């Protein structure tokens, strides 16, 4: 987890959402020291447990209700249970990662402090803060609008099914914990995206500095700068591995949630298309599909960018090798090439998969297959 | 995008088809200078928007018609919508790539000018021009014949369904924008194939020159030539990456269109086989399957050839290493081997997939699966 | 197969379960010498043949019985036959591997003796013995409890179907050989896990010793220690290959059994959910799913850990290269880096697949697909 | 294609089966010189065309017959057409490869002559001849027995369906060209297996010679021998590539035929199991499944062995590097290591796939999926 001053707003959002149970104090030097926040540790754990329990309580209440709104049919029951459970698993893994990633967070932020000292020329505090705030605000606004539209649509649907003997509006009101879980999931994804995008952006800054300083006393200082860049690259790779070690299970469950949600939302969209029962429902479902695709991108693109930018330092170093003659500088470039030869740049979600753009292809494949099988069964009866 | 005099006809075809919005002026030296053509930029954007709108207007008109010809049943409606949408997406991505790839086009053509100066011995302007013209003409003739056969078949089908109260021939006439989109797609594929085949052919010429000049003062000039070949190889790799960066989204949507069209056309072929309604329809559908397979090959084979030819320079350089003793020449060959060790040769379609022959296998797998699931559902009812 | 004093209990369990037909005598030095045990060789072969024959005899008896309990319907017959056959194949491959892996066992234990002499500082006999005994005891207790619950559930089910004219309890009693096969399978998995975890743990100990002795006369001895660590790494890789060569077919059939059991148990769980016939049956089936997942992990995690720990020596050696200057020590580190460059660390199950965590993903994919297809067919009729 | 005296019987079998249209004359030195055989070239082409035409003529005759025996139902018609077409495609690709692989055959046999001169110590003419003859004879006997059983079963089935007004035995007699195609396919597979096994066996002999001569004036001769072994390894890799370039399309169509035949034969086995119509049919179908699996192994195992043996020279060379000090010998070993670093050892079937044991896994996956989908559709109606 990256906790820097420009992105401190994302840290506070994650802290209140039970995802970053850390106490941060800003040094007189501008550095943010991080430590365990036992108050917020227990707050995060208790809030997650209570919200998961309330979500499943609302699910059971709807299922056992006189007139269920969402847990009506066996198919609807199964799909809604899966939909809620993937969110529960994703946010539970995220909260667990936040609870048990203090040491990795400290090491990552120390490494990033060193790297940013090395890459001071390419730093932009204003742009970084505004980008982080824009990402957090857009994600939170998107989930807020989507939750509002979903609640309105389901309230209308429950009212259409209302009978004087039973209230179906409270059935919808019992799904508020599920939407709270969705807000926590959005916060977790924003936090992870902030960290991974920071790593990829720093890799790009390192590559740009390399190209500027070697492709655009004095030789000794140049070699010292090349050494600093090599340590920065190695440290950024170790930071990517720290993010993997700390949040790979969260990323894996986010990916599982994304796949399940895409399949389930497309299936419900096509079921309502067959029924042609509520245009507002179709629009809300398409918005949900867009949101799930966008959060899949939010989790996949940062890691793809980080790996791609890390793996393109080899080419710059090869060109420098081809265009260098000083003995000390030539030795430094040879060492950098050796280092980059065996660099593992990809983000791993617990070793189950490598997180990059190829995942999208896999997802597409799976979705198509599952969508084709599910739709045909509905369309051949 | 490669814009050279021998293949200038392909460039003009792509320009009129809204895919190459560039102004080209031939230097007194025979070089083609490229710049933005704002007139043709707006022409391309407006033509694409108008043709997409007209295609979907014709689709809706058929769907809402008194006697739909193609958008008749829910299954037919879905499959026709997908068929049209994949073409729309492919040509829209191609036009977008053409609009926003001027800098990559300029860099690619500068690099190719340098490489062709290096590989002057193996150049064949006459053969290159005739190959490019033959590819463009065969592709355009194939799509023209296929569009004519499709229009005739659908006109006959609409006339067979005609009733005095409504005209079904205008329903067919409203699909002309879709066939225009098909012509644009053919132009885009011909352009991309021209560029990728040029890169693969230049890789092969480089390998042949290497083998001829090292396996078939003076030593200093030989080392200079080896250095020129090494820079040519690196530049061709960067050209492959320029083509990827500029047209990877277009290639990805071409691949998606190919997969969808193969599956959908095979499904309709087998549906009409079950119905046994029109032999001409079956022949036209088999021609469409052949065309979609051939355009899948047109997009996959050039990239496979480029990657394969790029990756076989390592073997020639290894043999030269094994058969060289001069100090300067030995150092040059060692540098070339180092360079080739870390060469990324494959064409990437936006990082989603690597474009080579293995894609065919994947496609086959997917098609088989989808074909098996779809056909069995139709055959078990 | 690893046969060491701390894990000798696992060896005896495997010996009685027909999986380790070896005679072991403890040297005065504490070394365990291993040789062929012809008495236990014939015992293992005969016991496996008799138990497989009795398992299939009980299966046929149930199928041909007046009131079959498990082999009732064609679907139930097929799924039960597959369930029994995967266990039979897994244990038969395990017993065959035990019979024909004496030379590999001897070489592996000699190599491990040398490695443990090298890594004496990080050895923990007490912890190793307690970990091995805990793994064996937990696995045996889990399978015992699961077999007891299964037998009780099936006895109750058979009694519910009992009629005065025929006894269905003997039908359940004829499945005892199948549960004996399950105990043998548990022993085989515990043995393989013990060996693979030993290899991964020794890789980790080697990496820790490297980091401690190089990142935390005298230089000559340090170089000698680095050489010892390099030989230890190469020997551990060869030990991983010995385990692969000896038990890859057993691991492959264990994986096949795991996939088939997960799919079949989930399918029966959902079938009984549709029927809602016996809550105890559902609980037993969920326990079986948990057990099959846990044994899939028991076979996949050790190999993933071994490969991961083997592949992270490259980074330590790279850092040492970056932080070393002595001529002899620098040459030693260069040799170690060369060695690690071309190290094949992954466990291979007969070349069919690489055993690591990605297998889980594959399994999940397959299961989902198969589960989706099977469930939908049941739910659309 | 390998044409050596020990395996000359396989060459003659392939020649008569239209697969090796070459004239071979044995030198006084024992070398076999190969040249184009125009007589046998036209014989091969004409025989293939005639047999394919007769096969499809018999297929159509059965389909159009009064009482079809095999081309009875739409499902049976489709599956039988696919079954015959995969064989036709495999043998047509094999015959085409034989026709257009004279230069590759000559280069491969020259390279093998050189390699066998280098590896004279490990040569065994008697064992090689007996192994080749045993493989050819076992394959031919297996296909002969299977064809006889199939013909007998189908003759009995046709007689059971015979009516006095029409003869169904001639319907079976019209499938003789299909069985002739099967004999040609067996010959092609035996030829390809002979060549690929020769390459893998020579790789193993090279590795054994390396280990014996370096791990079990004088130093100059030892270095010369190491150089000879390095050229032998490079030449064997080029021989593997020659086999790929010449017969990759044949191997690809053999693999496609194997997958289709396994799926189709399993499907027909389960269909007859549902019908329970003829026990002899079930036994013949299981024999066909065994034969198709065994020929899949015959095509997959040789390439897996060749690649595996080629890729294990790196380890021997690394150990020699670690255990060598002579300047010339150390340089020779360094060159060999450099060479092996970038060796592409795998057999490629036209770039579509790499032929090794992982293919089996893929096949299994596909088969399972397809088998599950096909069987469930039959079992849910
Ligand atoms: O299921 C359709 C959509 O509704 C939600 O459950 C929100 O309540 C989303 O998870 C899903 O995208
Ligand atoms: O759908 C069958 C065929 O007809 C087309 O739509 C052309 O109008 C093609 O896209 C397709 O190959
Ligand atoms: O089939 C459900 C479960 O019952 C067993 O067969 C045990 O008898 C297990 O193999 C399986 O997990
Ligand atoms: O189809 C079942 C079997 O019968 C054959 O067609 C032979 O005539 C084989 O190709 C197949 O294995």
Task: Describe this protein with a few key phrases.
homotetramer; about 375 residues; mainly alpha; two-stranded antiparallel sheet; binds beta-D-fructofuranose; membrane protein; gustatory receptor; ligand-gated ion channel; Gr43a
Biggest interface in this structure?
A-B, 23 and 19 residues
Structural class of chain A: mainly alpha
Oligomer: homotetramer
Order of helices and strands of chain A: HEEHHHHHHHHHHEEH
PDB class: membrane protein
Keywords: ligand-gated ion channel, fructose
Assembly: tetrameric
Entry title: The cryo-EM structure of insect gustatory receptor Gr43a from Drosophila melanogaster in complex with fructose
Describe this structure in words.
The PDB classes it as membrane protein. The structure is a homotetramer of 381-residue chains. Chain A is mostly helical and 381 residues long. The first copy, chain A, has one domain (8-379). The first copy, chain A, is built from twelve helices and four strands, in the order αββααααααααααββα. In chain A, the strands form two sheets. Chain A has a two-stranded antiparallel sheet with strand order 1-2. In chain A, helix 1 runs parallel beside helix 5 (125-160), helix 5 runs antiparallel to helix 7 (176-214) and helix 8 packs parallel to helix 12 (358-379). Chain A is elongated. The interface between A and B is medium-sized, with 23 and 19 residues. Residues 83, 150, 261, 264-265, 268, 285, 288, 292 of chain D line the site of one beta-D-fructofuranose (FRU).
């Amino acid at each position: 987890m990256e906790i820097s001053q420009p992105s401190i707003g994302i840290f506070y959002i994650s802290k209140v959402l039970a995802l970053a149970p850390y106490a941060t104090v800003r040094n007189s030097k501008g550095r943010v020291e991080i430590g365990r926040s036992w108050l917020f540790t227990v707050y995060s754990a208790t809030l997650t447990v209570v919200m998961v329990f309330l979500t499943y309580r609302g699910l059971l209440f709807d299922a056992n209700s006189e007139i269920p709104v969402r847990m009506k049919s066996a198919t609807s029951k199964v799909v809604t249970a899966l939909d809620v459970s993937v969110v529960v698993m994703a946010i539970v893994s995220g909260v667990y990662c936040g609870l048990f990633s203090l040491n990795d967070t400290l090491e990552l932020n120390d490494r990033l402090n060193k790297i940013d000292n090395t890459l001071n020329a390419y730093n932009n505090f204003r742009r970084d803060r505004w980008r982080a705030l824009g990402m957090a605000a857009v994600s939170l606004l998107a989930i807020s609008i989507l939750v509002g539209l979903d609640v309105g649509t389901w309230m209308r649907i429950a009212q259409d099914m209302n009978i004087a003997q039973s209230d179906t509006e409270l059935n919808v009101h019992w799904y508020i914990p599920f939407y709270s879980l969705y807000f926590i999931l959005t916060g977790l994804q924003v936090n992870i995206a902030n960290t991974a995008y920071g790593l990829g952006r720093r890799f790009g800054r390192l590559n740009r500095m390399l190209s500027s300083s070697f492709l655009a006393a004095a030789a000794k200082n140049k070699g010292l700068l090349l050494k600093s860049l090599a340590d920065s690259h190695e440290s950024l790779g170790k930071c990517v591995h720290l993010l993997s070690n700390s949040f790979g299970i969260a990323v894996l469950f986010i990916l599982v949630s994304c796949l399940l949600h895409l399949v389930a939302t497309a299936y419900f969209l096509f079921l309502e298309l067959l029924s042609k029962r509520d245009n507002g429902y179709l629009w809300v479902q398409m918005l949900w599909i867009c949101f799930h695709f966008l959060r899949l991108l939010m989790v996949v693109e940062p890691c793809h960018l980080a790996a791609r930018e890390s793996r393109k330092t080899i080419q710059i170093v090869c060109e420098i090798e081809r265009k260098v003659h000083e003995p000390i500088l030539a030795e430094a470039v040879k060492k950098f090439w050796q280092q980059l030869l065996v660099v593992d740049a990809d983000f791993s979600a617990c070793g189950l998969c490598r997180v990059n753009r190829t995942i999208l292809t896999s997802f597409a494949s799976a979705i198509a297959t599952y969508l084709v099988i599910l739709i045909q069964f509905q369309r051949t009866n």
